[PDB]
C-alpha cells in the first residue's frame, strides 16, 4: 500500500445473504485511503482479519468519503498504532496537531516512516480520536497550548538560490 494525501472513507459491508441467514448484520469501518478503490480493499482486509468474511462471500453496501466537520479549527488528534518492525510487532499511541483528521493520519504515516522506517503496509490504524488541550501526553503538542505564544524566525535561510545565480551582494538571513 502507498500513501498520498489520504482521505477518510466510511465503508459499510455485509456477507452475501443466504437461506440460512436471511438478514446478515451490517458492519462499518473507518478507512483512511488515497481513493475509494483501495479503501474497499483495506476494508475487506480488516474485515477478513476480524470476521469470517471475504470479498467473494460478501458485498460493499456503502462507501463514501467523510468530510471534516470543522476544517477551520485546530484540533489535537490521538492515534493508536499497530505496526510491524524488523523484530515483532508493537503497539503505539501518538498525538498530532492538525486541522483535519485525514491530515493527522497522513502526518502519522509520515512520522512513522521517518522515525521507525515503517512502510504503510506494515501499519494498521486502530482508532483516531480528537482530544482537547488536556489529556495530551506528548510535550511536543503541549508546548503549543499557549494563548500568548511568541517565537521569531531566527535563521531565515533564503530560497531562490538559482534565481539570478551570480550577484554582487551576499544574501541576508536576519528579518
Amino acid at each position: 500500500k502507498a500513501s498520498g494525501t489520504l482521505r477518510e472513507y466510511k465503508v459499510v459491508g455485509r456477507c452475501l445473504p443466504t437461506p440460512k441467514c436471511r438478514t446478515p448484520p451490517l458492519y462499518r469501518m473507518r478507512i483512511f485511503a488515497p481513493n475509494h478503490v483501495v479503501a474497499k480493499s483495506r476494508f475487506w482486509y480488516f474485515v477478513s482479519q476480524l470476521k469470517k468474511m471475504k470479498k467473494s462471500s460478501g458485498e460493499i453496501v456503502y462507501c463514501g468519503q467523510v468530510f471534516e466537520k470543522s476544517p477551520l479549527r485546530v484540533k489535537n488528534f490521538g492515534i493508536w498504532l499497530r505496526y510491524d518492525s524488523r523484530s515483532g510487532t508493537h503497539n503505539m499511541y501518538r498525538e498530532y496537531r492538525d486541522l483535519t483528521t485525514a491530515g493527522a493520519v497522513t502526518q502519522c504515516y509520515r512520522d512513522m516512516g521517518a522515525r521507525h522506517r515503517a512502510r504503510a503496509h506494515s501499519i494498521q490504524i486502530m482508532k483516531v480520536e480528537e482530544i482537547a488541550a488536556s489529556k495530551c501526553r506528548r510535550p511536543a503538542v503541549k508546548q503549543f497550548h499557549d494563548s500568548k505564544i511568541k517565537f521569531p524566525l531566527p535563521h531565515r535561510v533564503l530560497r531562490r538560490q538559482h534565481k539570478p545565480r551570480f550577484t554582487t551582494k551576499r544574501p541576508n538571513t536576519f528579518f
Partner: protein, 138 residues
C-alpha cells in the same frame, strides 16, 4: 535582537503561493512551521499557511487566538491596516517594481530622455561642488 515575532494578530506579507503579494493576519499556530491564517480584508480565506511563504511586517492587531473571522475583520478595519500599509516604504517599493514591470517602450524612451538630461545636470553640479571643495581644502 529580534523585533519581529509570530504573535496572534501579526500581519504578514505572502511572498509566494496562491495568495502572493497579499496581506494576511495570523490567527493561531498549528505547528512548528504552519499556522492558521485569515485575510478577510485582503480577499484571503481562513486556511493553514506555512511560515516559509510569509514575511511578517510590523503591524499587530489584538483579537483572541480563535476568533470566528468576524472580530479579526473588525479589528483590521479599526486599525486601518490597508492605509498604513500603503503609507509604508515596503508597499511603495512593491508598486515601483510593478510600474517597472508594466512600463512600455514609449515610456522607456521617455525615461531614457529624462535620465539623459537629469544625470548630466547632476554630474555638472557634482563637478562644480568637487572644484569648490578642492578650493576650500587648499
Amino acid at each position: 535582537v529580534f523585533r519581529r515575532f509570530v504573535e496572534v494578530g501579526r500581519v504578514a506579507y505572502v511572498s509566494f503561493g496562491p495568495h502572493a503579494g497579499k496581506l494576511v493576519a495570523i490567527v493561531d499556530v498549528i505547528d512548528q512551521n504552519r499556522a492558521l491564517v485569515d485575510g478577510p480584508c485582503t480577499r484571503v480565506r481562513r486556511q493553514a499557511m506555512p511560515f516559509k511563504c510569509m514575511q511578517l511586517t510590523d503591524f499587530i492587531l489584538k483579537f483572541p487566538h480563535s476568533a470566528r473571522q468576524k472580530y479579526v475583520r473588525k479589528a483590521w478595519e479599526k486599525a486601518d491596516i490597508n492605509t498604513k500599509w500603503a503609507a509604508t516604504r515596503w508597499a511603495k517599493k512593491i508598486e515601483a517594481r510593478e510600474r517597472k514591470a508594466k512600463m512600455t517602450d514609449f515610456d522607456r524612451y521617455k525615461v531614457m530622455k529624462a535620465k539623459k538630461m537629469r544625470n548630466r545636470i547632476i554630474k555638472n553640479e557634482v563637478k562644480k561642488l568637487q572644484r569648490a571643495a578642492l578650493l576650500k581644502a587648499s
